[PDB]
Fold Cas7-2x.
Amino acid sequence: ARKVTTRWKITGTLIAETPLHIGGVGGDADTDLALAVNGAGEYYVPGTSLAGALRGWMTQLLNNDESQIKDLWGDHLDAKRGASFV
RNA sequence: ACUGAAACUGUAGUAGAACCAAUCGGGGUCGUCAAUA
């Protein structure tokens, strides 16, 4: 497989400090923009939407350096990066 | 007159940007109603 010196499980509670809206495709007959729901119909944060939230912030932190970002979040086109480590 | 073996359809990607639940409105004030004798 991919070598992993150490795997880290990072977890905790995220609280909405303001209201939240991750959108699905949009519109449930009660709202023009409808919240994203999982296959069980439960309201959820897509891991895509949180990954890009955290990668996006990190991109601003690291002055939009592609190198260290792709070192942690993967890259489709570098010949030595591929899949994400987060 | 002899089954090929082995191989993740996967990798990167924030359903998001913009949008005022808002515009107008004195809690106000007078003669009506019935049809005959």
Summary: Residues 22-26, 33, 36, 46, 48-56, 70, 73-78, 81-84 of chain A lie near RNA strand B (CB under 10 Å from a C1'). Chain A is about 25% helix and 0% strand.
